[PDB]
Amino acid sequence: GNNRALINDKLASLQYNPKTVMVFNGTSISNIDLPAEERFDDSTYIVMTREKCSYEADFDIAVPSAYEDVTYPGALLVASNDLLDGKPQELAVDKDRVNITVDLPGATDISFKVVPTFANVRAGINDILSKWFDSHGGEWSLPANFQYSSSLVYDENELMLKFGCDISYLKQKLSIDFSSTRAEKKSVYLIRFKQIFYSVSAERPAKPADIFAESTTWEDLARAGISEEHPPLFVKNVQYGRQIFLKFESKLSSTELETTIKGTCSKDGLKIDANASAALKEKLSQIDVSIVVHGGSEAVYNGLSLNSMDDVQKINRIIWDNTLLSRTNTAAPLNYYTVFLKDGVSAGVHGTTEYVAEKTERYSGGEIRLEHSGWYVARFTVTWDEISYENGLKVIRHKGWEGNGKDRTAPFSTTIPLRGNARNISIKTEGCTGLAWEWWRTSGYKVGRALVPLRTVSIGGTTLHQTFSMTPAD
Amino acid sequence: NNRALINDKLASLQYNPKTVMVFNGTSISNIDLPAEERFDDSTYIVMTREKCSYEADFDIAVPSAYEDVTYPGALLVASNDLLDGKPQELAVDKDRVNITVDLPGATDISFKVVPTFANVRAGINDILSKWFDSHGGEWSLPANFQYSSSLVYDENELMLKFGCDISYLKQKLSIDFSSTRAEKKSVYLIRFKQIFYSVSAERPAKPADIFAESTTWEDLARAGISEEHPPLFVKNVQYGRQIFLKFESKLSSTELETTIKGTCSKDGLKIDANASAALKEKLSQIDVSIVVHGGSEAVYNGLSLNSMDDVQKINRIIWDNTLLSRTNTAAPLNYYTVFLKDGVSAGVHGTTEYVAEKTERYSGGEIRLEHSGWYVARFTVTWDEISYENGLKVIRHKGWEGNGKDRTAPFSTTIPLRGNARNISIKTEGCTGLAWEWWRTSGYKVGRALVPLRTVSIGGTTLHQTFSMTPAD
Fold it and tell me: What are the extents of the domains in chain A?
């Protein structure tokens, strides 16, 4: 009982700041040279603007695939930045008994006391699990009820921070490599469906040293890594369940990828249907789908397409599968929560990471049709502004139709084609009355109109009754 | 004999036409301009700045006080100072030119006299009293009408969009943009212009014909003539009336433009008597100045837009004297020049840089949660909160304090959010009492906008959970 009393004193005297001992490290971008850029796709004008952003959120710690046997409820760890990177460092010493509590929904919480070891905690969990589904028939079922998350992802750090997942696992299965992806002109959108089936918690002993066997000494802890820079931690809680990831990769722009997916996919699945779209499909055809399913079932799929109605229904089925939880069909560990052993303060961290958001806007070209059928001489004036980005400067050039002011007779009809960089259209029509005190009469003067696909201005009538109609009548 | 020699001096007087007069635009430094934010009260305001430039043809206005030297058939020394409203008179003695008055509907009636401010003015008005006498009409329609409007950043943007005389407007409207920008005021300008008639002059083929036989080449070098400063001929002058309306405000550029564009048109100002209280308080922050340049001049300061009598007064100023009459003198507006030697246009293209200021306003809002059903529910509300700090758009994920907590009916509460909240998601769950399916999701809405009021109502029973959201979407 003398060794524990030394561990308590050395623990209580171990001075460290809970907030700064582990720290998320995100991407930094350090450069303001993000000028707008432009191009044309025939009459279509495509402007791409870039903005530096950072995303801030509580960092959820995934249970790594390769360290499940070290992150079980009641495990001990040495705090280390390498825990945030998916490599938690076991604190391997002998321990005394701890209360482990399984929280299953609709059931009263059953607990059991054992020395926290992977084999002991696992057996205890699987026993309580046996009694629960050995009491719902053989072993039974849980319908899909998912938390939903979606986002474009710039790099591995935005991914980890928004989705709280094990990058290492997801890199294996979904084949995520952002150097290859940006080297091509590809963007990535990611959806996650997440369902927690049950949780398992562990109570930290009032006096912390009580977690150790009586034989363990302070000197064993220091040899394993413990110190003020690496205080000990206690796995307070692990969640178990099922997780589905959908990765959408495209050469389309970020903005067009996000818009296409946001309109065809949601928390309800994929509602993509036939007879109300046609260029949507040539977009969709450019989107490669990958899927990984983890917990319950285990599956990965690659090479699916959203044109096919039967790929869409295969996806929705994967998503809305009921899971038959049993001894032969387990749940996967998803996230775990650590507390500092010294006092029981959380070791959850905040994370920040910077990224470059790219916004693409497409502005379609258009036409102005002028038609004169009136019994008089008429002139048309058409002007507009043309937008250009030349280095980091929005250049605005006033322009004019070559025919402005010229006299026009009898049946006259022309089309003025405009590209998507034209704004601020002004149109004026005048008809010569033939009478000296009112020689030119203005039948229409529309300024500041927008470029629409087809604008038609018709004048007709006679010298003293001049008609004007514009379509659309903006 | 001086004609032989003056004519050959303009042999190949070395100058490029396009280079001898060049528009001097504003240039902006390329120091970074970061987004700026502030809050009024729960309303969130983001201000962004973009460096721009505007290019167009530069219409040269007739400067007040240089009308004596920019009449048709007058002679000028070329020079960057002309673009700035100080054209340099070339005062030598001149022969006779054919000057042609162009009245709308009239035959082009010409006369040949010695180019002089007094000569052409008398010659034009003599032609005017003749066209008026041969008409029972007191009034005729102008040859042309033009309506323009824009925000203005500095004097150069103003000169280029409007082809105005900067100096006349600076004095009459007391414009100064270094003071205006300091006080955080924005400026919207509108112009109405009527050209009643033009008055052109034909340039003789043998250019020297324009000088009396007594003037020599040395009388001209003494007037300032060079290769750097070739001679100009005022070929055509437009006469009429012009009015400027200057709208000045502590409102933002975006909001000033949007308010004026919606209450002004080529027909004048329209304010609906049934105006929203929001719209009326913005109009109450707009001060209106007016400069009228015609046969009569006038300047108005401190007009307002807050009553229909204020709007009437302004529309009456705009449309007063917009028809040519015997009693309603036209005034010179714009003038066009050729190089005396060969006759090509001395007209220049212009470019100027400015900083455009785009302001967006994001009102606050509430989410009301209501629970009426016969079961235990929990709500989950999250959003992102936007900030601009340094040059960084910062997005902080936030959650309602009450998330995940069991709620028993009746429950009601309100979550207030300010306008930097975006991307709202709301999840409502109900406990069925069945171990199979303990928790059932009854509504899950993500990526929603912050509206002034979003109501989420849940009711029903454990196995029939009802859900309504208003606005649905």
Answer: 1-21+60-145+196-241+324-347, 23-59+348-364, 146-195+242-323, 365-474
